[PDB]
Amino acid sequence: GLFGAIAGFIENGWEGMIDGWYGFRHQNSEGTGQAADLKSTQAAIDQINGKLNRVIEKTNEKFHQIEKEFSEVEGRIQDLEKYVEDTKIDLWSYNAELLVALENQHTIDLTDSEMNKLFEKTRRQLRENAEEMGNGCFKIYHKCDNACIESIRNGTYDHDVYRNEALNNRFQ
Amino acid sequence: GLFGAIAGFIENGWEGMIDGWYGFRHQNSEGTGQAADLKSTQAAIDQINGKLNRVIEKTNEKFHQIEKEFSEVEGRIQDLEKYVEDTKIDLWSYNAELLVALENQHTIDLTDSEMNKLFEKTRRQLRENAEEMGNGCFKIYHKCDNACIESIRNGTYDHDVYRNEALNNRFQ
Amino acid sequence: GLFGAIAGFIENGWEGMIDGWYGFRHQNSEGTGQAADLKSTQAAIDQINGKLNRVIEKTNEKFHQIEKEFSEVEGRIQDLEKYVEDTKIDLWSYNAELLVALENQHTIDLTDSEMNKLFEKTRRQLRENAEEMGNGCFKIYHKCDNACIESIRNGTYDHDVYRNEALNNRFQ
Amino acid sequence: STATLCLGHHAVPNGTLVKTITDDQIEVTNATELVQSSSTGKICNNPHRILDGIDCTLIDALLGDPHCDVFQNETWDLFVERSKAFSNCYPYDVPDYASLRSLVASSGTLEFITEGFTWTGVTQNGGSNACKRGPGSGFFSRLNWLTKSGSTYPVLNVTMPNNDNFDKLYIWGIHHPSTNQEQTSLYVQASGRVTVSTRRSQQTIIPNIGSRPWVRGLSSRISIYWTIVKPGDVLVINSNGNLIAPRGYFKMRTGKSSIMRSDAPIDTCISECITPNGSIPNDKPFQNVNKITYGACPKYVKQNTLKLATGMRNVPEKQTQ
Amino acid sequence: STATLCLGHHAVPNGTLVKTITDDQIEVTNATELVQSSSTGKICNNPHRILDGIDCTLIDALLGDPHCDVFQNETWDLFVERSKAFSNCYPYDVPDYASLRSLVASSGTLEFITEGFTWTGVTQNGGSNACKRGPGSGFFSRLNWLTKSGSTYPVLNVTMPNNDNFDKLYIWGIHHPSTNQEQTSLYVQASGRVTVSTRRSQQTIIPNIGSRPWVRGLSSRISIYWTIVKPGDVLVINSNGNLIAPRGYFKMRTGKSSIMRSDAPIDTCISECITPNGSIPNDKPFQNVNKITYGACPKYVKQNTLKLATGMRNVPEKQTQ
Amino acid sequence: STATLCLGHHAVPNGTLVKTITDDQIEVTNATELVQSSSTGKICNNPHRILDGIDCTLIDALLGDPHCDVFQNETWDLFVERSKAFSNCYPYDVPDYASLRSLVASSGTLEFITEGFTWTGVTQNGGSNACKRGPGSGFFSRLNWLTKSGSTYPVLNVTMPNNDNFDKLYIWGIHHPSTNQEQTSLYVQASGRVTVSTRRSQQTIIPNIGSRPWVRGLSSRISIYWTIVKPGDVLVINSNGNLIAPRGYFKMRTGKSSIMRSDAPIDTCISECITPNGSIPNDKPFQNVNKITYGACPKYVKQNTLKLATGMRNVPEKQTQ
Numbered sequence A, B, C: 001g002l003f004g005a006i007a008g009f010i011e012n013g014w015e016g017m018i019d020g021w022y023g024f025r026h027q028n029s030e031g032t033g034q035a036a037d038l039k040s041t042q043a044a045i046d047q048i049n050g051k052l053n054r055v056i057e058k059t060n061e062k063f064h065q066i067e068k069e070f071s072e073v074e075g076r077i078q079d080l081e082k083y084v085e086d087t088k089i090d091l092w093s094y095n096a097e098l099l100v101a102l103e104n105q106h107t108i109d110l111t112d113s114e115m116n117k118l119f120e121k122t123r124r125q126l127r128e129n130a131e132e133m134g135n136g137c138f139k140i141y142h143k144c145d146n147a148c149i150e151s152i153r154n155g156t157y158d159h160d161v162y163r164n165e166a167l168n169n170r171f172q
Numbered sequence D, E, F: 001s002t003a004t005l006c007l008g009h010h011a012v013p014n015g016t017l018v019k020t021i022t023d024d025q026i027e028v029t030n031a032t033e034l035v036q037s038s039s040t041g042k043i044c045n046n047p048h049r050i051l052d053g054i055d056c057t058l059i060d061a062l063l064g065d066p067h068c069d070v071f072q073n074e075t076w077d078l079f080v081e082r083s084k085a086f087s088n089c090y091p092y093d094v095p096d097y098a099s100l101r102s103l104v105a106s107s108g109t110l111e112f113i114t115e116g117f118t119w120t121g122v123t124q125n126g127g128s129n130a131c132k133r134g135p136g137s138g139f140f141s142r143l144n145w146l147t148k149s150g151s152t153y154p155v156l157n158v159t160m161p162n163n164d165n166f167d168k169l170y171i172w173g174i175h176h177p178s179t180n181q182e183q184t185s186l187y188v189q190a191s192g193r194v195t196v197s198t199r200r201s202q203q204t205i206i207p208n209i210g211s212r213p214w215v216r217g218l219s220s221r222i223s224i225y226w227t228i229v230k231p232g233d234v235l236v237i238n239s240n241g242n243l244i245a246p247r248g249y250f251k252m253r254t255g256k257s258s259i260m261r262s263d264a265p266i267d268t269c270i271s272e273c274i275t276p277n278g279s280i281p282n283d284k285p286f287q288n289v290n291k292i293t294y295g296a297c298p299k300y301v302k303q304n305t306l307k308l309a310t311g312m313r314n315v316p317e318k319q320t321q
């Protein structure tokens, strides 16, 4: 019954994250909290919407074409007509199949990428004041209350102010 | 005649790795060893097989179509027939060319990715007890025999037990 | 009026970099300098040229085909002719659209990748003698004149010779 | 004292499966359908002018089969032919029927201009009980059945110049009597002929004598032919028997008109895309409803579903016992 | 004391080149071929019913050219026409030959039902030395050569109703004599005619007098025509000369049948895909063997090879001197 | 003392927008156009042999319309038909004109071999004032207008064997007189016929009597037909009137020849690709100039521009105030 312990994105999702796609969970002196990251969440959503608005846009308007069903057997000309339509349909079916496979592969990759990019940026902020636990979580080597955590999340964290306290905890 | 010295994956392959796609080489107190990583090796193989089973699967069954060779000159109708088939063939030839180019580009990228992912995970395990030499190899800053190496490979390495010995070697 | 201060590639380009695609800017004891990296620049250009030489190469040579404009109304056969050509044109227009979208997406990604790869390699050289400022720039924690910077750029930097001086600046 | 900051992404309890280059089955958080697979079963009469042929084919509307009289001078973006349609005039066939149907359907109009044709020496306005209009015998409204007058049928030789700026479509026919007795009672000569010509085209038909299957009282037949006359050009009709004469021309247009075979009911609603199944929405790039479409339609495709991922990979949360 | 842990990937001494978006030539560790470029040269007779026409075209099997008698009431998934095939009956031509061949090949069957046709006033079962069956003169097995009786050839007028649930295919012909003397010796009238009709279709042919090239003894010709009769509909044949009469109908089917021109030998083996080159395997998505295929076949493609990478980039191991 | 080493990429002041899977608009540093959208308006006469038909259609060059005499025995890779072209010989029509034009254009040659045809009992070399060559009446150079001699027109029956290794193309015609008086003044018989046959093909045409529109003096017409004779096979011509006789055959070839309708001027320059708009370069994979092309051409596409990125994303440099 391991409860209360938090873990990051490494082979792990969060069903409790409802106000964002990506975000933070923390354990500090003041307990346990969670907050969504709007920027990374927005970045992914925008990319999804870009792809969607490219595919769902611009219908082809067609009018008089060729007949495609036939009540009589005729031979050569009808053979050619059916073959033309069947050729066309197989080619568009192929394009449709390939399109969604490529788009979905890219969707999964861009969303993984956003997660990783948020992780790298957070690490960049932390400098020498934190270590990577290897589970998508950082061990902050200093007192970091809710305001300290928030400064990391809102990108104004000042690593110098904690640096000396952190090195002593890390090394000594 | 530089022999015995080992190097990692940076612009470098291993012809002696035969029981795996990815893996470890080490130099410790007990000499020199090598071991394949089954997980990463398996991950890549599965992805290769997924792509293969999507392409090699589901043949199209066709029956009565149009004639495609002709013993007589006829003009208009035969022009159209040949043009239809030639149009179809060029389009499928294009799909075939594009398909393998995309798949092979993605194959190379996913296999590079697996290598990098194994490297990052190994670094994550090592924490502050090792440094990256920049050749795909880690310098372990503590006594690490064959059992220590194996614990890194089988993912049960306990960095705390070596941490203090490592920092002294690294820093002091 | 913040002038003279340099920043890296993080959400930032350099309009003054004209002799390369990727490169270095530095601030040391001897002032401020800039130098292009030929290798990474060349790598990207080669990949761009590979894609270009695959697309611009091998024109299709066609001769006698079908008529595509008509001075008389005829009905069925002409319906089929126009429909065949219109089917063909829409399919090639689709291939054209998809091709450039894929190629441009991949172009942008491979060029971003080259930038990141240059950054990782530079970090690898620096070992424990530098820290990542989080703006695409390194803070070198030792005296590093123009010859020291150049040794980093030309890939012969000896981190041992600066290591002890760097740790004292970093930690103590 | 320390702190733990974890980074992670969301996941849902109701994931959905999509395809990639690699997997047949990846669960992601959200997905959208790209294949329109459904229709209401009704054809919307907005914004395309839909013309319900009801009991009439386009060809029967063209000729003037009496129970199709309601369709005179009619126009359409899409003509709709029903399976309940029936012919109820003179037994006829159209060589290359499909081409005539096509070109008229594409023209999009049955605008007919009566022309002052002069048929000297012959009886006009022939009728049949196979083609009733009102109580008595009748004929195709757009055709003129010519027969002998007295005991003579002269060599008809007439002209109609096109001095307009559009193309004229002429519909004419040839009578095939069932007996030699019929062949001489109407047209005197033992074998008639019909020659219709412009300066660059000619069609001569020699009528055939013979019993055909009984249709609405008759074993005789009429074969329908057409002639297009460009501006500057001219029409000439020459015959010594069996001419089923035109009464004028149909005005030809170019544009977006077509024809569709469907039994789907017409409804007061709005839709750009029409299938024989009925109208379908065009919000999705693809559709599996029908390869036959008219208007702004999704492309027909064999797959009944294609799922585009609109969210990240759905990954379950870990819990240690 | 320290330790060195290196991470690396495998490489092989026998790499192979593939293409990407970028490179024309990347060496990878392993690759598989996607283009089937080879055939055994033999057509497998499993699982498709293959019918070797041997010396007979499908059309000659249809009509009843004596040396094709073995093919009566025959069926097939794929009919195979050989280059060695020859006609050895009455000299004939088929207007729109390709369409007749196509529709019969697609129907997939030569199931013939003899019908009790009644030809009053005329001689039946005409034969020729150009079409021998056994020792003496003969004719197409499915056709009935009608000529005058006494010094008269009456106006033939017959009916065959289709009260079945399938389509009937009728094969009939018109005789073209080489001389006016021939034209009056057989059929009395100076010019015959043949009218075959349903309620919605009619074909009238007027025979042509003239010397054609000498073929198997003859300068006369027979032209072959066909008529399909739907259920509920009815056949009517009317002629006063030159009628080459049907003896019944062919049962029409819909399905997977086709025809192929090939000289490839039939073999006892198993294969879904058939080319004129012979059977090919269908494990690869593409093939370069022939654009002409039948069955579950890879898609035809212009490339003779396409290599799919099945391994990582092959990178050589470094050694310092 | 420390140091700061920054890594960064270039950017330009003149960026350009491209498309990706994601964005309609990404600015990158450099891009290249993939759609050829422009033509000089001129057709280059290198390296394809271009033949300017000037005032002559290919068909009129084929037949021997006098003002097209300059085109005898001519060859081409691409024949160019002008809108200014006019016929100035006997009023004629060609059933399936498009097929004759096509096959001759593809053959690529008007190489004509005169054959020693023998027409016994008839007058040869008929001429008309509708087809002048020099001061007096004339006719198509490749055709021979046959009429009665004395008061008789015998049954013509001739042979031309093909003992060459190539296919012979025969061009022949049927005269349609405007009056019965014309029909008996030239050919004696009340109704002529023309039968042209090989061992596997026959075409019989019965001329039609009737007034057609006045063209260059005439209301009569000639209908043009063709016959291909394979090696080993043989030609037979049979007629008792209205035969417009061939004077030999055209040598048929297979190859890269075609035909194009264009008013673009021919110019001394070099280009592989030809459109009716004029020559276009083939350095780009796609073109938007014309769907009609000949030679090594980019593929036709609906987009007027497609921009391939040839550089990285263009990112602006930051400056703090």
Ligand SMILES: *[C@@H]1O[C@H](CO)[C@@H](O[C@@H]2O[C@H](CO)[C@@H](O[C@@H]3O[C@H](CO[C@H]4O[C@H](CO)[C@@H](O)[C@H](O)[C@@H]4O[C@H]4O[C@H](CO)[C@@H](O)[C@H](O)[C@H]4NC(C)=O)[C@@H](O)[C@H](O[C@H]4O[C@H](CO)[C@@H](O)[C@H](O)[C@@H]4O)[C@@H]3O)[C@H](O)[C@H]2NC(C)=O)[C@H](O)[C@H]1NC(C)=O
Pocket (backbone or CB within 6 Å): A052, D030, D031, D032, D310
């Ligand atoms: C699973 O994944 C899918 C992703 O596909 C996702 O579904 C998507 O959810 C989106 C968010 O809600 C939704 O987008 C919205 O669509 C609204 C529809 O109204 C308009 O649709 C037209 C499209 O044809 C559009 O052009 C037009 O603006 C429509 O409104 C107006 O025009 C029409 C006719 O032109 C007229 O009849 C209307 O009356 C007129 N409106 C009015 C008021 O008169 C949008 O309106 C909506 O807009 C929102 O964003 C805008 C800017 O971004 C703001 O201006 C606005 O205020 C809103 O905030 C929004 O764009 C997608 O339609 C939907 N896609 C599908 C396929 O269903 C799921 O949500 C996701 N699930 C989860 C759990 O994440």
Ligand SMILES: *[C@@H]1O[C@H](CO)[C@@H](O[C@@H]2O[C@H](CO)[C@@H](O[C@@H]3O[C@H](CO[C@H]4O[C@H](CO)[C@@H](O)[C@H](O)[C@@H]4O[C@H]4O[C@H](CO)[C@@H](O)[C@H](O)[C@H]4NC(C)=O)[C@@H](O)[C@H](O[C@H]4O[C@H](CO)[C@@H](O)[C@H](O)[C@@H]4O)[C@@H]3O)[C@H](O)[C@H]2NC(C)=O)[C@H](O)[C@H]1NC(C)=O
Pocket (backbone or CB within 6 Å): B052, E030, E031, E032, E310
């Ligand atoms: C270079 O790269 C290529 C990658 O393309 C790689 O080649 C691949 O190697 C694979 C590994 O050996 C190989 O996969 C194997 O195929 C076996 C073939 O048998 C079966 O093939 C059918 C395909 O149509 C399959 O559906 C069916 O199971 C076949 O067997 C059975 O059915 C048939 C008819 O349906 C019947 O006639 C047989 O009698 C019947 N079998 C029996 C016993 O009655 C597979 O059998 C084999 O299975 C293995 O894996 C399974 C689970 O993964 C296990 O169940 C099983 O025990 C085996 O362990 C395996 O899947 C690919 O075919 C091959 N591809 C190509 C294109 O050649 C190279 O190896 C690589 N080189 C290097 C050096 O890496």
Ligand SMILES: *[C@@H]1O[C@H](CO)[C@@H](O[C@@H]2O[C@H](CO)[C@@H](O[C@@H]3O[C@H](CO[C@H]4O[C@H](CO)[C@@H](O)[C@H](O)[C@@H]4O[C@H]4O[C@H](CO)[C@@H](O)[C@H](O)[C@H]4NC(C)=O)[C@@H](O)[C@H](O[C@H]4O[C@H](CO)[C@@H](O)[C@H](O)[C@@H]4O)[C@@H]3O)[C@H](O)[C@H]2NC(C)=O)[C@H](O)[C@H]1NC(C)=O
Pocket (backbone or CB within 6 Å): C052, F030, F031, F032, F310
């Ligand atoms: C924005 O992005 C675009 C990227 O598309 C970029 O534009 C590209 O710039 C390239 C660099 O200048 C340029 O490439 C050059 O093309 C030269 C053209 O000459 C040759 O072109 C033929 C192509 O059909 C080629 O096959 C042949 O070699 C041509 O020369 C010779 O053959 C022809 C006929 O076959 C004959 O008529 C000529 O006489 C004969 N030459 C001689 C001397 O007799 C190349 O010549 C040039 O070569 C350079 O590189 C070679 C090795 O890489 C060296 O051998 C050589 O010395 C040169 O250094 C080079 O390849 C692209 O053409 C151009 N593309 C487009 C679409 O315009 C922009 O520069 C970029 N902008 C920025 C700011 O980055």
Ligand SMILES: *[C@@H]1O[C@H](CO)[C@@H](O[C@@H]2O[C@H](CO)[C@@H](O[C@@H]3O[C@H](CO[C@H]4O[C@H](CO)[C@@H](O)[C@H](O)[C@@H]4O)[C@@H](O)[C@H](O[C@H]4O[C@H](CO)[C@@H](O)[C@H](O)[C@@H]4O)[C@@H]3O)[C@H](O)[C@H]2NC(C)=O)[C@H](O)[C@H]1NC(C)=O
Pocket (backbone or CB within 6 Å): D211, D212, D213, D214, D215, D219, E157, E158, E159, E234, E236
């Ligand atoms: C060449 O051969 C064809 C085919 O054999 C012949 O065509 C047939 O022609 C006859 C008449 O000439 C058709 O027979 C029937 O005629 C009836 C009308 O005449 C009858 O009506 C009066 C009352 O008004 C009766 O007292 C008296 O018996 C008359 O004979 C129609 O009412 C018939 O309709 C039938 O068919 C329908 C549908 O099939 C049924 O529902 C009806 O109940 C009824 O049974 C019918 O038309 C006959 O139909 C024709 N057959 C075909 C196939 O067309 C040619 O006449 C012949 N030519 C020559 C010169 O001999």
Ligand SMILES: *[C@@H]1O[C@H](CO)[C@@H](O[C@@H]2O[C@H](CO)[C@@H](O[C@@H]3O[C@H](CO[C@H]4O[C@H](CO)[C@@H](O)[C@H](O)[C@@H]4O)[C@@H](O)[C@H](O[C@H]4O[C@H](CO)[C@@H](O)[C@H](O)[C@@H]4O)[C@@H]3O)[C@H](O)[C@H]2NC(C)=O)[C@H](O)[C@H]1NC(C)=O
Pocket (backbone or CB within 6 Å): E211, E212, E213, E214, E215, E219, F157, F158, F159, F234, F236
């Ligand atoms: C209109 O014009 C056409 C073409 O010119 C004429 O058609 C030709 O008709 C003649 C016969 O009428 C064909 O001539 C040959 O007939 C031989 C049979 O008759 C001969 O046989 C006896 C013995 O049984 C001999 O003693 C005697 O000479 C008879 O004359 C065939 O055996 C011939 O075969 C030849 O051709 C083959 C292949 O080409 C060779 O291998 C043979 O060895 C042999 O040389 C031949 O058939 C002649 O072939 C016809 N030509 C064509 C092109 O069809 C029409 O007759 C004419 N019409 C009118 C009314 O005049």
Ligand SMILES: *[C@@H]1O[C@H](CO)[C@@H](O[C@@H]2O[C@H](CO)[C@@H](O[C@@H]3O[C@H](CO[C@H]4O[C@H](CO)[C@@H](O)[C@H](O)[C@@H]4O)[C@@H](O)[C@H](O[C@H]4O[C@H](CO)[C@@H](O)[C@H](O)[C@@H]4O)[C@@H]3O)[C@H](O)[C@H]2NC(C)=O)[C@H](O)[C@H]1NC(C)=O
Pocket (backbone or CB within 6 Å): D157, D158, D159, D234, D236, F211, F212, F213, F214, F215, F219
């Ligand atoms: C069946 O019906 C058709 C159509 O109605 C008739 O065809 C017409 O035939 C007549 C002549 O038979 C054509 O009339 C004109 O003939 C002129 C030549 O003859 C005249 O020339 C002398 C001097 O040489 C005059 O003194 C005298 O009036 C003669 O009558 C041509 O010069 C005419 O050209 C006209 O047309 C052109 C372009 O349209 C104009 O630019 C000219 O200025 C001039 O007006 C003209 O050809 C008449 O054109 C024919 N019509 C058609 C549609 O073809 C058949 O004759 C008729 N058949 C029977 C048996 O009755």
Ligand SMILES: *[C@@H]1O[C@H](CO)[C@@H](O[C@@H]2O[C@H](CO)[C@@H](O)[C@H](O)[C@H]2NC(C)=O)[C@H](O)[C@H]1NC(C)=O
Pocket (backbone or CB within 6 Å): A146, A147, A148, A150, A151, A154, A156
């Ligand atoms: C989170 O980011 C916001 C926005 O940058 C910071 O905003 C401050 O919010 C405080 C409330 O605690 C206000 O009184 C100040 O006016 C804001 N400061 C500035 C400079 O805008 C906020 O400080 C950040 N969170 C923490 C804990 O520092």
Ligand SMILES: *[C@@H]1O[C@H](CO)[C@@H](O[C@@H]2O[C@H](CO)[C@@H](O)[C@H](O)[C@H]2NC(C)=O)[C@H](O)[C@H]1NC(C)=O
Pocket (backbone or CB within 6 Å): B146, B147, B148, B150, B151, B154, B156
């Ligand atoms: C490598 O991983 C395996 C599997 O996790 C570890 O398994 C132990 O193997 C030893 C043999 O040396 C057994 O006696 C134990 O039963 C296993 N332990 C557990 C917890 O399953 C193994 O320890 C790892 N290698 C090293 C060197 O530690």
Ligand SMILES: *[C@@H]1O[C@H](CO)[C@@H](O[C@@H]2O[C@H](CO)[C@@H](O)[C@H](O)[C@H]2NC(C)=O)[C@H](O)[C@H]1NC(C)=O
Pocket (backbone or CB within 6 Å): C146, C147, C148, C150, C151, C154, C156
């Ligand atoms: C930059 O790299 C170059 C090439 O590796 C180094 O080349 C040396 O250049 C010096 C000039 O300062 C020459 O005298 C030497 O002959 C070169 N040395 C070698 C080993 O080739 C250069 O040293 C590097 N830059 C710095 C500052 O070290």
Ligand SMILES: *[C@@H]1O[C@H](CO)[C@@H](O)[C@H](O)[C@H]1NC(C)=O
Pocket (backbone or CB within 6 Å): D012, D014, D015, D016, D029, D030, D031
């Ligand atoms: C999951 O359920 C929620 C609420 O029931 C719904 O809004 C959402 O669309 C569902 N997602 C999927 C992929 O079904």
Ligand SMILES: *[C@@H]1O[C@H](CO)[C@@H](O)[C@H](O)[C@H]1NC(C)=O
Pocket (backbone or CB within 6 Å): D072, D073, D111, D112, D113, D114
């Ligand atoms: C058909 O149109 C003509 C002229 O356009 C007109 O004279 C005639 O009355 C119209 N017929 C009907 C039924 O509207």
Ligand SMILES: *[C@@H]1O[C@H](CO)[C@@H](O)[C@H](O)[C@H]1NC(C)=O
Pocket (backbone or CB within 6 Å): E012, E014, E015, E016, E029, E030, E031
């Ligand atoms: C390399 O050689 C081995 C053994 O000879 C063989 O199994 C393997 O398929 C070869 N690989 C390639 C790519 O040829």
Ligand SMILES: *[C@@H]1O[C@H](CO)[C@@H](O)[C@H](O)[C@H]1NC(C)=O
Pocket (backbone or CB within 6 Å): E072, E073, E111, E112, E113, E114
């Ligand atoms: C052909 O089939 C019919 C009926 O199906 C049958 O009467 C006849 O004998 C068959 N002929 C042969 C040669 O089997």
Ligand SMILES: *[C@@H]1O[C@H](CO)[C@@H](O)[C@H](O)[C@H]1NC(C)=O
Pocket (backbone or CB within 6 Å): F012, F014, F015, F016, F029, F030, F031
């Ligand atoms: C930008 O300008 C330079 C010089 O004016 C030019 O060489 C280059 O091609 C331009 N780039 C673009 C993308 O227009």
